[PDB]
Symmetry: C2
Subunit: 422 residues, 2 copies
Amino acid sequence: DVVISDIEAREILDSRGYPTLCVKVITNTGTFGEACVPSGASTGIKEALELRDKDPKRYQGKGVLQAISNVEKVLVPALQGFSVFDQITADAIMIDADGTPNKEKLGANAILGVSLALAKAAANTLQRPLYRYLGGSFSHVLPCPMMNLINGGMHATNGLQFQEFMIRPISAPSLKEAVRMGAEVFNALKKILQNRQLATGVGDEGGFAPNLASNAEALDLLLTAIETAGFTPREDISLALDCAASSFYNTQDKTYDGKSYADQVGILAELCEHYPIDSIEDGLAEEDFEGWKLLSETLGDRVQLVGDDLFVTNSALIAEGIAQGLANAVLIKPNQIGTLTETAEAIRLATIQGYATILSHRSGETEDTTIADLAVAFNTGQIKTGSLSRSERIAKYNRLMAIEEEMGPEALFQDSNPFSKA
Amino acid sequence: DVVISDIEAREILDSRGYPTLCVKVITNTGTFGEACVPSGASTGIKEALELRDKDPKRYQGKGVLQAISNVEKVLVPALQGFSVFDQITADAIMIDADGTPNKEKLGANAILGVSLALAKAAANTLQRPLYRYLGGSFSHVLPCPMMNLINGGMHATNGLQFQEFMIRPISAPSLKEAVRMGAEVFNALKKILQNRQLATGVGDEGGFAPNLASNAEALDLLLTAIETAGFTPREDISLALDCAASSFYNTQDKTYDGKSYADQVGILAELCEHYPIDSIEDGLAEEDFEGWKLLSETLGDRVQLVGDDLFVTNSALIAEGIAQGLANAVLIKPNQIGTLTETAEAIRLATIQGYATILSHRSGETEDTTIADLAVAFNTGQIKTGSLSRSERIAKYNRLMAIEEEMGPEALFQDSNPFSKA
Ligand SMILES: [Cl-]
Ligand SMILES: [Mg+2]
Ligand SMILES: [Mg+2]
Ligand SMILES: [Mg+2]
Ligand SMILES: [Mg+2]
Ligand SMILES: [Mg+2]
C-alpha cells in the first residue's frame, strides 16, 4: 500500500507578484505530486479563509509563511501513513484538524495545497492522467471556454465597471480550434485598440484594460474584433459577462453604483436584448436575494446565470440557492472552499439539479494547471481560465489541448450552456 | 545504455497568444523530458531562423506546424538510437541535418525544442537536477536578476523609446530575498502609477506600460517606487536598461530617431551621470561598429555594457566583438542560436575573456523554466527573466527559489556585474 510519507511546502509568487504556496506530497515509494494555490481579488465574503502572515515589513503583509508552517507542522503528522488514494479521508482529516467552518485556523490555502497535491501524488503513483484518476474512465468532455478579453473592475485600474468581458467560441469543433478562434479574436482586438489610440496593456487576467466610456463600449469592441477576425457573432462566437457586482454594491444603501436591484436587472436585460450575451455571472451582489430572485425570474429561462460569490463553491449554499430558484449555473473555484472533496460535492449537487458548472481560475493564478484536469474529470462542459495572454492563463489552454490530443477519439468538445446561441 | 526512442512535438501558445512548440524526448526506458520554445519580438537580424508556417488563414501566419513536422519526420530518424547523454553529439547531428548556418531549413525552434528536451530527458533519467546535469557538481551560484518593471519599445504600444527599464536588487542576501524586493517595488510602482492617473496595464514582459513623456520619466518612476518601498537607491537597488536600439535605428541614414551614434552615446552617458544605472543593454544598434566602439571607450570601464542583438548568442560574433573591444557582457538567449551546445560555447568563450553572461528570456515566453537552471548550471551570476507579474516570468523566479532551497548550504547568491553600484 502506498501511503503519505511527507509533505513539503514553499512560498512562491502568483501571477500578480503576491506570495502563495506550492505543496508537494511525497509517498513512501518516492512518488510525489505538486500543486500551487491561486488567490482571488474580488473574493466573496463567504469564501474559506486565505491565511496571510500580516507582517507589514514583508510583502506588505501578504506572506504565507504561517500557512506553510501549518502544512509542515500540523497537516504532516495528521496525514502521515494514510493511503495516498483515500482522497475523501485525507480531506476530512484536514477539515477536522482545522476544526472551523471556514478553515480559519490552518488556512484554506494550506489545506487546498495539500488536497490538490495529494490527488496528483496518487495519479502519479498509478501513472494515470489526473483527470482519469479524479473522474474515472468516462471523463472525456472538453469544456467550452469563456475567454476574458477585456478586463475591468478589481482586475484593472481603468474604471471599467464590470469585471470580465468574455467571448465563447461555441462553433469550435475542438478545444484546440476554440483556442485558435479566441487567440485570433484577441490579437485582432489588440490592433483595433491600437488604431483607436486605446491602451493595449493587459489587466490581471490577460485581457486589455483600456479606459472606456461604459460597459457597452467593451461589448462593442468584442463584436468588432469577432467580425474583424472573420467570425460571425452569435453564430460562431457569443458573449459572456462577469459583473462581479459585489465589487460595486453599497450594502448600506443597497445600490449598485446608485442603481437599485430592479434597475440593475433592467440594465442586464437590456444588454441581453442588444448583444449576443448567453451568460451573466454575479449580475447581483452575493447576498441580494430579492435581486437574484428577480434576475432569475426575468432572464433565467433565456440566459445562463452564473453564481460565483453567490455560492462560493460551497455545497450548503448551492443547495440553499437551488431550493430558492436562484441562478442556473455554478462557478467552481476550489480555493473558495478549500478541498477537492468539497469541490467535487459542490459539482455533484449542482449537476444533479440541472445546473451547469464552470471550472474557474482566480485572478491571481500560478503555473499550476489543475483546473484544466478538473473540468475534464467532471465533464463540466465549461471552463473560465482567462484571456489569450499571460501564461498563467495560457498554460491551462495548453493543458486542455494536451488532454484533448491524449484522449484521441475519446475526446468530445461540448458546451454545457443550455442557453447557448448555438 | 539509455538511448533516444521517440520525439513528440505539439503546438501550444506562448504568453502573447502566438503559437510555439513544446517537444518531448522519450528514451527506450520510458523516461522523458519536455521543453517549450520562446519567441522574441525585437529580434536581431542575425538570430537563427524561427520557422513559421505563413498560412494567412491560421494564426495570422504564425503557426509552427512545419517546425513540428520537421521534429517528427526529420529529427526523430536522425536521432533515434543515440545516447540520451551525448548532448553535443545530438546537437551536432541536428545542425548537420539542417545544413544551413542559420538553421533555415528545419527551423531553430524545431532544433532548440529537441535540444532542451533532450537534456531534460537525460537529467530525468539520472534523477538529477537539470542544473547539475548541465553544469556539473559545482553549479551553485544563484544569479542576481534584472527586473523589467516598465515596458516600452516593441513590447508595448505606449510609444516609450527604450524597451526595458529594470531594477537590480543588489543588496539581497539571497535570490528569494531579491524576488521579494522586486515584488515590493513592483507593487509600490502600481499604486504610484494609479495615483498619477497613469495606466497599470502591463506590457509583454509584465512591466507597466503607461504613456510617459520620456525615457527619463520611466527612470524617475523606478526611483520613486524604490524609495516608496523603503529601499535605498544605488545601495539596495540599482537600475538597468535594455534600449534595444536596433528598434529605433534608421538604416537609411544610420541615425537613432534622428540622432547620430555620437549623440546617442552622449545621451546614455548623461543618463548614467544622473541615475544609478549600472548596466545598459543594446545602447547602439546591432551592426553599429563606430557607435559600439565609442560607447565601449566612453562607458565600458564604468558600467556594464550588454550585447544582445550585437552578439545573438553566437560564438563567432562574440569572439569577433571581443577582439574588437566591444561591450563587456553578453546576453544569452538559447533560441537566438538554436542548440544548448552552442549556447554553452557562447557562454564559455565570453566568460574566459572576462565578459559577464546573463541568461535571458524572450518577450514571448512559456511556462518552461529552463533558463533558470541554465543560469545556475553555468554560474553566470545574472539573469533577465521579466517583471514581477505574468507567470511566464514568475515561474522562472519560482524555479530559481526552488533551486536555491534545494542546494541548501551549497547555494551562493552573487551578482557577476563587476560595475555594480554595490
Ligand atoms: Cl498612461
Ligand atoms: Mg471574484
Ligand atoms: Mg467572478
Ligand atoms: Mg530584442
Ligand atoms: Mg527583427
Ligand atoms: Mg534585448
